Amino acid sequence: FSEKPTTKSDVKIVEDILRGKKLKFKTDSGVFSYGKVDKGTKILVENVVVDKDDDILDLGCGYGVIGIALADEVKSTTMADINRRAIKLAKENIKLNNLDNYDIRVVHSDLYENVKDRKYNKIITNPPIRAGKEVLHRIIEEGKELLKDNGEIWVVIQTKQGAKSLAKYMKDVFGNVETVTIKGGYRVLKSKKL
Protein backbone atom coordinates (compact mmCIF):
# COMPACT_ATOMS: atom_id res chain seq x y z
CA PHE A 1 0.00 0.00 0.00
CA SER A 2 1.10 3.62 -0.22
CA GLU A 3 1.27 6.12 2.62
CA LYS A 4 2.15 9.80 3.02
CA PRO A 5 4.69 10.01 5.91
CA THR A 6 4.54 12.54 8.74
CA THR A 7 8.30 12.61 9.30
CA LYS A 8 10.52 15.46 8.07
CA SER A 9 13.35 14.85 5.58
CA ASP A 10 16.92 16.25 5.77
CA VAL A 11 17.76 18.30 2.69
CA LYS A 12 21.12 19.55 1.44
CA ILE A 13 21.63 21.53 -1.75
CA VAL A 14 24.75 20.54 -3.64
CA GLU A 15 26.47 22.20 -6.61
CA ASP A 16 29.05 20.61 -8.82
CA ILE A 17 30.56 20.82 -12.26
CA LEU A 18 29.91 17.92 -14.61
CA ARG A 19 30.83 17.70 -18.26
CA GLY A 20 31.80 21.32 -17.80
CA LYS A 21 28.30 22.31 -16.72
CA LYS A 22 27.52 24.17 -13.50
CA LEU A 23 24.70 22.16 -11.96
CA LYS A 24 22.76 22.35 -8.70
CA PHE A 25 20.94 19.53 -6.93
CA LYS A 26 18.57 19.30 -4.02
CA THR A 27 19.58 16.05 -2.16
CA ASP A 28 17.86 14.29 0.75
CA SER A 29 18.99 11.92 3.50
CA GLY A 30 16.46 9.34 2.30
CA VAL A 31 17.98 9.25 -1.17
CA PHE A 32 21.32 7.98 -2.44
CA SER A 33 24.34 10.27 -2.21
CA TYR A 34 22.98 12.81 0.24
CA GLY A 35 25.07 15.98 0.40
CA LYS A 36 27.50 15.37 -2.47
CA VAL A 37 27.69 14.04 -5.98
CA ASP A 38 28.87 10.45 -5.77
CA LYS A 39 32.41 9.83 -7.09
CA GLY A 40 31.27 6.85 -9.14
CA THR A 41 28.42 8.80 -10.62
CA LYS A 42 30.79 11.67 -11.51
CA ILE A 43 33.24 9.35 -13.27
CA LEU A 44 30.39 7.71 -15.20
CA VAL A 45 28.89 11.05 -16.26
CA GLU A 46 32.24 12.44 -17.39
CA ASN A 47 33.04 9.37 -19.47
CA VAL A 48 29.78 8.42 -21.11
CA VAL A 49 29.60 9.19 -24.83
CA VAL A 50 26.23 10.26 -26.19
CA ASP A 51 24.81 11.30 -29.56
CA LYS A 52 22.38 14.17 -30.21
CA ASP A 53 19.73 11.71 -31.45
CA ASP A 54 19.91 9.36 -28.47
CA ASP A 55 16.90 8.44 -26.37
CA ILE A 56 18.43 7.59 -23.00
CA LEU A 57 17.40 5.93 -19.77
CA ASP A 58 19.01 6.83 -16.42
CA LEU A 59 18.14 3.78 -14.34
CA GLY A 60 18.02 4.22 -10.57
CA CYS A 61 18.26 7.96 -11.02
CA GLY A 62 18.25 9.07 -7.40
CA TYR A 63 17.98 12.86 -7.41
CA GLY A 64 18.78 13.02 -11.10
CA VAL A 65 22.48 13.63 -11.65
CA ILE A 66 23.02 11.47 -14.74
CA GLY A 67 19.87 12.48 -16.60
CA ILE A 68 20.28 16.16 -15.79
CA ALA A 69 23.98 16.23 -16.73
CA LEU A 70 23.22 14.70 -20.12
CA ALA A 71 19.76 16.06 -21.00
CA ASP A 72 20.83 18.93 -23.26
CA GLU A 73 23.11 16.65 -25.28
CA VAL A 74 20.56 14.05 -26.40
CA LYS A 75 17.12 13.65 -27.97
CA SER A 76 15.17 12.46 -24.92
CA THR A 77 15.85 11.42 -21.36
CA THR A 78 13.90 9.11 -19.07
CA MET A 79 14.97 9.00 -15.41
CA ALA A 80 13.53 6.15 -13.34
CA ASP A 81 13.66 5.14 -9.69
CA ILE A 82 11.63 3.12 -7.25
CA ASN A 83 12.10 5.72 -4.47
CA ARG A 84 9.22 8.26 -4.63
CA ARG A 85 11.21 10.89 -2.79
CA ALA A 86 13.98 10.48 -5.41
CA ILE A 87 11.46 10.99 -8.22
CA LYS A 88 10.24 14.18 -6.52
CA LEU A 89 13.77 15.56 -6.16
CA ALA A 90 14.74 14.73 -9.75
CA LYS A 91 11.67 16.63 -11.01
CA GLU A 92 12.58 19.60 -8.81
CA ASN A 93 16.19 19.41 -9.98
CA ILE A 94 15.14 19.65 -13.64
CA LYS A 95 13.80 23.11 -12.68
CA LEU A 96 16.91 24.10 -10.71
CA ASN A 97 18.98 23.56 -13.83
CA ASN A 98 16.78 25.29 -16.43
CA LEU A 99 16.15 22.12 -18.43
CA ASP A 100 12.45 22.72 -18.92
CA ASN A 101 13.00 23.11 -22.69
CA TYR A 102 14.11 19.51 -23.16
CA ASP A 103 12.33 16.18 -23.53
CA ILE A 104 12.85 14.79 -20.04
CA ARG A 105 10.53 12.65 -17.98
CA VAL A 106 10.88 11.18 -14.50
CA VAL A 107 9.04 7.90 -13.94
CA HIS A 108 8.41 5.79 -10.86
CA SER A 109 9.63 2.27 -11.68
CA ASP A 110 10.77 -0.95 -10.00
CA LEU A 111 13.82 -1.47 -12.20
CA TYR A 112 12.55 -1.41 -15.82
CA GLU A 113 8.94 -2.26 -15.07
CA ASN A 114 7.40 1.12 -15.86
CA VAL A 115 9.70 2.36 -18.64
CA LYS A 116 9.23 -0.33 -21.27
CA ASP A 117 6.96 1.94 -23.34
CA ARG A 118 9.89 2.77 -25.60
CA LYS A 119 13.31 1.51 -26.65
CA TYR A 120 16.54 3.32 -25.82
CA ASN A 121 19.85 4.08 -27.47
CA LYS A 122 21.61 4.22 -24.12
CA ILE A 123 20.88 2.84 -20.64
CA ILE A 124 23.17 4.47 -18.06
CA THR A 125 23.36 3.43 -14.44
CA ASN A 126 25.28 3.44 -11.15
CA PRO A 127 23.66 0.24 -9.88
CA PRO A 128 22.97 -0.65 -6.24
CA ILE A 129 25.47 -3.24 -4.97
CA ARG A 130 24.23 -4.43 -1.57
CA ALA A 131 21.07 -5.58 -3.38
CA GLY A 132 23.12 -8.51 -4.66
CA LYS A 133 24.36 -9.92 -7.96
CA GLU A 134 20.93 -11.21 -9.05
CA VAL A 135 19.64 -7.65 -9.33
CA LEU A 136 22.81 -6.62 -11.17
CA HIS A 137 22.38 -9.46 -13.67
CA ARG A 138 18.77 -8.48 -14.21
CA ILE A 139 19.76 -4.89 -15.04
CA ILE A 140 22.02 -6.27 -17.75
CA GLU A 141 19.80 -8.99 -19.21
CA GLU A 142 16.55 -6.99 -19.27
CA GLY A 143 18.50 -3.98 -20.47
CA LYS A 144 19.44 -5.76 -23.68
CA GLU A 145 15.75 -6.24 -24.48
CA LEU A 146 15.15 -2.50 -24.21
CA LEU A 147 18.02 -1.31 -26.36
CA LYS A 148 17.68 -0.26 -29.98
CA ASP A 149 20.09 -1.90 -32.41
CA ASN A 150 23.62 -0.59 -31.72
CA GLY A 151 22.36 0.72 -28.40
CA GLU A 152 24.67 0.59 -25.39
CA ILE A 153 24.42 -0.02 -21.67
CA TRP A 154 26.91 1.84 -19.45
CA VAL A 155 27.54 0.97 -15.83
CA VAL A 156 29.95 2.14 -13.15
CA ILE A 157 31.04 -0.35 -10.50
CA GLN A 158 33.84 -0.42 -7.95
CA THR A 159 36.84 -2.28 -9.28
CA LYS A 160 38.67 -5.57 -8.84
CA GLN A 161 36.70 -8.79 -8.92
CA GLY A 162 33.34 -7.01 -8.70
CA ALA A 163 33.77 -5.15 -11.95
CA LYS A 164 35.40 -8.28 -13.43
CA SER A 165 32.51 -10.57 -12.51
CA LEU A 166 30.03 -8.08 -13.94
CA ALA A 167 32.09 -7.54 -17.12
CA LYS A 168 32.07 -11.33 -17.65
CA TYR A 169 28.30 -11.39 -17.31
CA MET A 170 27.87 -8.43 -19.67
CA LYS A 171 30.03 -10.23 -22.25
CA ASP A 172 27.91 -13.35 -21.68
CA VAL A 173 24.73 -11.43 -22.37
CA PHE A 174 25.83 -9.00 -25.10
CA GLY A 175 28.69 -10.83 -26.77
CA ASN A 176 30.98 -7.91 -25.93
CA VAL A 177 32.12 -5.64 -23.11
CA GLU A 178 34.60 -2.84 -22.80
CA THR A 179 36.23 -1.07 -19.89
CA VAL A 180 35.97 2.58 -20.80
CA THR A 181 37.79 3.94 -17.83
CA ILE A 182 39.23 2.95 -14.48
CA LYS A 183 39.66 5.76 -12.01
CA GLY A 184 40.11 5.80 -8.23
CA GLY A 185 38.85 2.26 -7.77
CA TYR A 186 35.87 2.65 -10.12
CA ARG A 187 35.38 1.06 -13.50
CA VAL A 188 33.05 2.22 -16.28
CA LEU A 189 31.84 -0.74 -18.35
CA LYS A 190 30.05 -0.51 -21.69
CA SER A 191 28.32 -3.21 -23.82
CA LYS A 192 26.68 -2.70 -27.25
CA LYS A 193 23.58 -4.42 -28.59
CA LEU A 194 24.50 -6.27 -31.79
PDB file of C-alpha atoms in Angstrom:
ATOM      1  CA  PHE A   1       0.000   0.000   0.000  1.00  0.00           C
ATOM      2  CA  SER A   2       1.097   3.620  -0.221  1.00  0.00           C
ATOM      3  CA  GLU A   3       1.269   6.117   2.624  1.00  0.00           C
ATOM      4  CA  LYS A   4       2.151   9.798   3.024  1.00  0.00           C
ATOM      5  CA  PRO A   5       4.688  10.006   5.913  1.00  0.00           C
ATOM      6  CA  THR A   6       4.537  12.537   8.739  1.00  0.00           C
ATOM      7  CA  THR A   7       8.299  12.614   9.297  1.00  0.00           C
ATOM      8  CA  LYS A   8      10.516  15.464   8.066  1.00  0.00           C
ATOM      9  CA  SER A   9      13.348  14.855   5.581  1.00  0.00           C
ATOM     10  CA  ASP A  10      16.915  16.247   5.771  1.00  0.00           C
ATOM     11  CA  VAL A  11      17.756  18.297   2.687  1.00  0.00           C
ATOM     12  CA  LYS A  12      21.122  19.548   1.440  1.00  0.00           C
ATOM     13  CA  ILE A  13      21.631  21.531  -1.754  1.00  0.00           C
ATOM     14  CA  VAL A  14      24.753  20.541  -3.642  1.00  0.00           C
ATOM     15  CA  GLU A  15      26.470  22.196  -6.614  1.00  0.00           C
ATOM     16  CA  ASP A  16      29.048  20.612  -8.818  1.00  0.00           C
ATOM     17  CA  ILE A  17      30.556  20.818 -12.256  1.00  0.00           C
ATOM     18  CA  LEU A  18      29.914  17.916 -14.607  1.00  0.00           C
ATOM     19  CA  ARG A  19      30.835  17.705 -18.265  1.00  0.00           C
ATOM     20  CA  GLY A  20      31.803  21.320 -17.799  1.00  0.00           C
ATOM     21  CA  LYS A  21      28.298  22.308 -16.722  1.00  0.00           C
ATOM     22  CA  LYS A  22      27.517  24.166 -13.505  1.00  0.00           C
ATOM     23  CA  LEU A  23      24.699  22.165 -11.957  1.00  0.00           C
ATOM     24  CA  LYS A  24      22.762  22.354  -8.696  1.00  0.00           C
ATOM     25  CA  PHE A  25      20.940  19.526  -6.935  1.00  0.00           C
ATOM     26  CA  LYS A  26      18.570  19.296  -4.021  1.00  0.00           C
ATOM     27  CA  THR A  27      19.578  16.047  -2.160  1.00  0.00           C
ATOM     28  CA  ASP A  28      17.862  14.293   0.747  1.00  0.00           C
ATOM     29  CA  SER A  29      18.987  11.922   3.498  1.00  0.00           C
ATOM     30  CA  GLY A  30      16.462   9.341   2.305  1.00  0.00           C
ATOM     31  CA  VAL A  31      17.982   9.253  -1.167  1.00  0.00           C
ATOM     32  CA  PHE A  32      21.319   7.978  -2.437  1.00  0.00           C
ATOM     33  CA  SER A  33      24.341  10.275  -2.207  1.00  0.00           C
ATOM     34  CA  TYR A  34      22.979  12.813   0.241  1.00  0.00           C
ATOM     35  CA  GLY A  35      25.068  15.980   0.403  1.00  0.00           C
ATOM     36  CA  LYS A  36      27.501  15.370  -2.468  1.00  0.00           C
ATOM     37  CA  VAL A  37      27.691  14.043  -5.978  1.00  0.00           C
ATOM     38  CA  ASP A  38      28.868  10.447  -5.773  1.00  0.00           C
ATOM     39  CA  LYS A  39      32.410   9.834  -7.093  1.00  0.00           C
ATOM     40  CA  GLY A  40      31.275   6.846  -9.139  1.00  0.00           C
ATOM     41  CA  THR A  41      28.424   8.801 -10.622  1.00  0.00           C
ATOM     42  CA  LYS A  42      30.791  11.666 -11.509  1.00  0.00           C
ATOM     43  CA  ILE A  43      33.237   9.347 -13.268  1.00  0.00           C
ATOM     44  CA  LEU A  44      30.394   7.712 -15.198  1.00  0.00           C
ATOM     45  CA  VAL A  45      28.891  11.049 -16.260  1.00  0.00           C
ATOM     46  CA  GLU A  46      32.243  12.443 -17.388  1.00  0.00           C
ATOM     47  CA  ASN A  47      33.040   9.374 -19.474  1.00  0.00           C
ATOM     48  CA  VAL A  48      29.776   8.419 -21.110  1.00  0.00           C
ATOM     49  CA  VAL A  49      29.600   9.185 -24.832  1.00  0.00           C
ATOM     50  CA  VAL A  50      26.230  10.258 -26.194  1.00  0.00           C
ATOM     51  CA  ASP A  51      24.810  11.297 -29.564  1.00  0.00           C
ATOM     52  CA  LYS A  52      22.379  14.173 -30.207  1.00  0.00           C
ATOM     53  CA  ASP A  53      19.734  11.714 -31.453  1.00  0.00           C
ATOM     54  CA  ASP A  54      19.911   9.358 -28.473  1.00  0.00           C
ATOM     55  CA  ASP A  55      16.897   8.438 -26.365  1.00  0.00           C
ATOM     56  CA  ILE A  56      18.426   7.590 -23.003  1.00  0.00           C
ATOM     57  CA  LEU A  57      17.396   5.935 -19.771  1.00  0.00           C
ATOM     58  CA  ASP A  58      19.008   6.830 -16.417  1.00  0.00           C
ATOM     59  CA  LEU A  59      18.145   3.782 -14.339  1.00  0.00           C
ATOM     60  CA  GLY A  60      18.021   4.222 -10.565  1.00  0.00           C
ATOM     61  CA  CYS A  61      18.255   7.964 -11.018  1.00  0.00           C
ATOM     62  CA  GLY A  62      18.254   9.073  -7.400  1.00  0.00           C
ATOM     63  CA  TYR A  63      17.981  12.864  -7.414  1.00  0.00           C
ATOM     64  CA  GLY A  64      18.783  13.020 -11.101  1.00  0.00           C
ATOM     65  CA  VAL A  65      22.478  13.633 -11.649  1.00  0.00           C
ATOM     66  CA  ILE A  66      23.019  11.473 -14.738  1.00  0.00           C
ATOM     67  CA  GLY A  67      19.874  12.480 -16.599  1.00  0.00           C
ATOM     68  CA  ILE A  68      20.282  16.164 -15.792  1.00  0.00           C
ATOM     69  CA  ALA A  69      23.982  16.234 -16.731  1.00  0.00           C
ATOM     70  CA  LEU A  70      23.223  14.699 -20.123  1.00  0.00           C
ATOM     71  CA  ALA A  71      19.759  16.064 -21.005  1.00  0.00           C
ATOM     72  CA  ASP A  72      20.832  18.928 -23.264  1.00  0.00           C
ATOM     73  CA  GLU A  73      23.105  16.646 -25.279  1.00  0.00           C
ATOM     74  CA  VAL A  74      20.562  14.049 -26.399  1.00  0.00           C
ATOM     75  CA  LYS A  75      17.116  13.654 -27.971  1.00  0.00           C
ATOM     76  CA  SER A  76      15.173  12.463 -24.920  1.00  0.00           C
ATOM     77  CA  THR A  77      15.853  11.421 -21.360  1.00  0.00           C
ATOM     78  CA  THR A  78      13.899   9.113 -19.071  1.00  0.00           C
ATOM     79  CA  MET A  79      14.966   8.995 -15.408  1.00  0.00           C
ATOM     80  CA  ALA A  80      13.533   6.152 -13.340  1.00  0.00           C
ATOM     81  CA  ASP A  81      13.657   5.138  -9.686  1.00  0.00           C
ATOM     82  CA  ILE A  82      11.634   3.115  -7.246  1.00  0.00           C
ATOM     83  CA  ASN A  83      12.102   5.721  -4.471  1.00  0.00           C
ATOM     84  CA  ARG A  84       9.224   8.265  -4.626  1.00  0.00           C
ATOM     85  CA  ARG A  85      11.215  10.891  -2.794  1.00  0.00           C
ATOM     86  CA  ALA A  86      13.981  10.476  -5.414  1.00  0.00           C
ATOM     87  CA  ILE A  87      11.458  10.990  -8.218  1.00  0.00           C
ATOM     88  CA  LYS A  88      10.238  14.179  -6.523  1.00  0.00           C
ATOM     89  CA  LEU A  89      13.767  15.559  -6.165  1.00  0.00           C
ATOM     90  CA  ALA A  90      14.743  14.727  -9.749  1.00  0.00           C
ATOM     91  CA  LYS A  91      11.668  16.628 -11.013  1.00  0.00           C
ATOM     92  CA  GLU A  92      12.580  19.597  -8.812  1.00  0.00           C
ATOM     93  CA  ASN A  93      16.192  19.411  -9.982  1.00  0.00           C
ATOM     94  CA  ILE A  94      15.143  19.647 -13.639  1.00  0.00           C
ATOM     95  CA  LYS A  95      13.800  23.110 -12.676  1.00  0.00           C
ATOM     96  CA  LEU A  96      16.912  24.103 -10.715  1.00  0.00           C
ATOM     97  CA  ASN A  97      18.975  23.561 -13.826  1.00  0.00           C
ATOM     98  CA  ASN A  98      16.781  25.287 -16.425  1.00  0.00           C
ATOM     99  CA  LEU A  99      16.149  22.123 -18.432  1.00  0.00           C
ATOM    100  CA  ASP A 100      12.448  22.725 -18.920  1.00  0.00           C
ATOM    101  CA  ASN A 101      13.003  23.114 -22.687  1.00  0.00           C
ATOM    102  CA  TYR A 102      14.111  19.509 -23.159  1.00  0.00           C
ATOM    103  CA  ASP A 103      12.331  16.182 -23.535  1.00  0.00           C
ATOM    104  CA  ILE A 104      12.854  14.794 -20.039  1.00  0.00           C
ATOM    105  CA  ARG A 105      10.534  12.651 -17.979  1.00  0.00           C
ATOM    106  CA  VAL A 106      10.881  11.176 -14.496  1.00  0.00           C
ATOM    107  CA  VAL A 107       9.039   7.903 -13.943  1.00  0.00           C
ATOM    108  CA  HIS A 108       8.411   5.791 -10.861  1.00  0.00           C
ATOM    109  CA  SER A 109       9.625   2.270 -11.682  1.00  0.00           C
ATOM    110  CA  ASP A 110      10.767  -0.948 -10.005  1.00  0.00           C
ATOM    111  CA  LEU A 111      13.823  -1.465 -12.199  1.00  0.00           C
ATOM    112  CA  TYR A 112      12.546  -1.411 -15.821  1.00  0.00           C
ATOM    113  CA  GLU A 113       8.943  -2.257 -15.069  1.00  0.00           C
ATOM    114  CA  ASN A 114       7.399   1.123 -15.857  1.00  0.00           C
ATOM    115  CA  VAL A 115       9.698   2.357 -18.642  1.00  0.00           C
ATOM    116  CA  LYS A 116       9.227  -0.327 -21.269  1.00  0.00           C
ATOM    117  CA  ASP A 117       6.963   1.940 -23.335  1.00  0.00           C
ATOM    118  CA  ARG A 118       9.892   2.775 -25.599  1.00  0.00           C
ATOM    119  CA  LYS A 119      13.307   1.509 -26.654  1.00  0.00           C
ATOM    120  CA  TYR A 120      16.537   3.322 -25.823  1.00  0.00           C
ATOM    121  CA  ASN A 121      19.852   4.081 -27.472  1.00  0.00           C
ATOM    122  CA  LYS A 122      21.607   4.216 -24.116  1.00  0.00           C
ATOM    123  CA  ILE A 123      20.880   2.842 -20.645  1.00  0.00           C
ATOM    124  CA  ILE A 124      23.172   4.470 -18.060  1.00  0.00           C
ATOM    125  CA  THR A 125      23.361   3.430 -14.443  1.00  0.00           C
ATOM    126  CA  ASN A 126      25.281   3.445 -11.150  1.00  0.00           C
ATOM    127  CA  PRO A 127      23.660   0.238  -9.882  1.00  0.00           C
ATOM    128  CA  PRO A 128      22.972  -0.648  -6.245  1.00  0.00           C
ATOM    129  CA  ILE A 129      25.470  -3.237  -4.966  1.00  0.00           C
ATOM    130  CA  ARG A 130      24.227  -4.430  -1.574  1.00  0.00           C
ATOM    131  CA  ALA A 131      21.074  -5.583  -3.380  1.00  0.00           C
ATOM    132  CA  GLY A 132      23.115  -8.512  -4.664  1.00  0.00           C
ATOM    133  CA  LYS A 133      24.358  -9.925  -7.956  1.00  0.00           C
ATOM    134  CA  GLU A 134      20.925 -11.205  -9.045  1.00  0.00           C
ATOM    135  CA  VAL A 135      19.643  -7.645  -9.332  1.00  0.00           C
ATOM    136  CA  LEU A 136      22.812  -6.615 -11.165  1.00  0.00           C
ATOM    137  CA  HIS A 137      22.384  -9.457 -13.667  1.00  0.00           C
ATOM    138  CA  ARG A 138      18.771  -8.478 -14.214  1.00  0.00           C
ATOM    139  CA  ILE A 139      19.758  -4.888 -15.040  1.00  0.00           C
ATOM    140  CA  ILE A 140      22.025  -6.273 -17.752  1.00  0.00           C
ATOM    141  CA  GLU A 141      19.799  -8.989 -19.205  1.00  0.00           C
ATOM    142  CA  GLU A 142      16.550  -6.991 -19.274  1.00  0.00           C
ATOM    143  CA  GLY A 143      18.504  -3.984 -20.469  1.00  0.00           C
ATOM    144  CA  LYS A 144      19.437  -5.765 -23.676  1.00  0.00           C
ATOM    145  CA  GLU A 145      15.754  -6.242 -24.481  1.00  0.00           C
ATOM    146  CA  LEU A 146      15.151  -2.496 -24.211  1.00  0.00           C
ATOM    147  CA  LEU A 147      18.018  -1.310 -26.364  1.00  0.00           C
ATOM    148  CA  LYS A 148      17.683  -0.258 -29.978  1.00  0.00           C
ATOM    149  CA  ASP A 149      20.087  -1.904 -32.411  1.00  0.00           C
ATOM    150  CA  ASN A 150      23.619  -0.593 -31.720  1.00  0.00           C
ATOM    151  CA  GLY A 151      22.362   0.724 -28.397  1.00  0.00           C
ATOM    152  CA  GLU A 152      24.674   0.586 -25.389  1.00  0.00           C
ATOM    153  CA  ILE A 153      24.418  -0.020 -21.665  1.00  0.00           C
ATOM    154  CA  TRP A 154      26.909   1.838 -19.449  1.00  0.00           C
ATOM    155  CA  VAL A 155      27.536   0.968 -15.826  1.00  0.00           C
ATOM    156  CA  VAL A 156      29.945   2.135 -13.153  1.00  0.00           C
ATOM    157  CA  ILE A 157      31.043  -0.352 -10.505  1.00  0.00           C
ATOM    158  CA  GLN A 158      33.839  -0.423  -7.952  1.00  0.00           C
ATOM    159  CA  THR A 159      36.845  -2.283  -9.277  1.00  0.00           C
ATOM    160  CA  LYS A 160      38.671  -5.568  -8.838  1.00  0.00           C
ATOM    161  CA  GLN A 161      36.700  -8.789  -8.919  1.00  0.00           C
ATOM    162  CA  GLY A 162      33.336  -7.007  -8.700  1.00  0.00           C
ATOM    163  CA  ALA A 163      33.774  -5.148 -11.951  1.00  0.00           C
ATOM    164  CA  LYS A 164      35.399  -8.281 -13.429  1.00  0.00           C
ATOM    165  CA  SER A 165      32.510 -10.569 -12.512  1.00  0.00           C
ATOM    166  CA  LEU A 166      30.027  -8.077 -13.938  1.00  0.00           C
ATOM    167  CA  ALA A 167      32.089  -7.543 -17.122  1.00  0.00           C
ATOM    168  CA  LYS A 168      32.072 -11.326 -17.650  1.00  0.00           C
ATOM    169  CA  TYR A 169      28.298 -11.393 -17.310  1.00  0.00           C
ATOM    170  CA  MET A 170      27.869  -8.434 -19.670  1.00  0.00           C
ATOM    171  CA  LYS A 171      30.033 -10.229 -22.252  1.00  0.00           C
ATOM    172  CA  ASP A 172      27.914 -13.346 -21.680  1.00  0.00           C
ATOM    173  CA  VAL A 173      24.729 -11.426 -22.373  1.00  0.00           C
ATOM    174  CA  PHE A 174      25.826  -8.997 -25.098  1.00  0.00           C
ATOM    175  CA  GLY A 175      28.685 -10.829 -26.772  1.00  0.00           C
ATOM    176  CA  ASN A 176      30.979  -7.905 -25.927  1.00  0.00           C
ATOM    177  CA  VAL A 177      32.121  -5.639 -23.110  1.00  0.00           C
ATOM    178  CA  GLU A 178      34.602  -2.838 -22.801  1.00  0.00           C
ATOM    179  CA  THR A 179      36.225  -1.074 -19.894  1.00  0.00           C
ATOM    180  CA  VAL A 180      35.967   2.580 -20.800  1.00  0.00           C
ATOM    181  CA  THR A 181      37.786   3.938 -17.831  1.00  0.00           C
ATOM    182  CA  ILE A 182      39.229   2.947 -14.475  1.00  0.00           C
ATOM    183  CA  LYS A 183      39.658   5.759 -12.011  1.00  0.00           C
ATOM    184  CA  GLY A 184      40.107   5.797  -8.232  1.00  0.00           C
ATOM    185  CA  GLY A 185      38.850   2.257  -7.772  1.00  0.00           C
ATOM    186  CA  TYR A 186      35.866   2.647 -10.121  1.00  0.00           C
ATOM    187  CA  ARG A 187      35.381   1.060 -13.501  1.00  0.00           C
ATOM    188  CA  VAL A 188      33.048   2.218 -16.275  1.00  0.00           C
ATOM    189  CA  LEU A 189      31.844  -0.741 -18.354  1.00  0.00           C
ATOM    190  CA  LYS A 190      30.046  -0.514 -21.687  1.00  0.00           C
ATOM    191  CA  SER A 191      28.323  -3.212 -23.822  1.00  0.00           C
ATOM    192  CA  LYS A 192      26.683  -2.697 -27.252  1.00  0.00           C
ATOM    193  CA  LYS A 193      23.576  -4.418 -28.589  1.00  0.00           C
ATOM    194  CA  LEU A 194      24.498  -6.265 -31.787  1.00  0.00           C
TER     195      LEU A 194
END
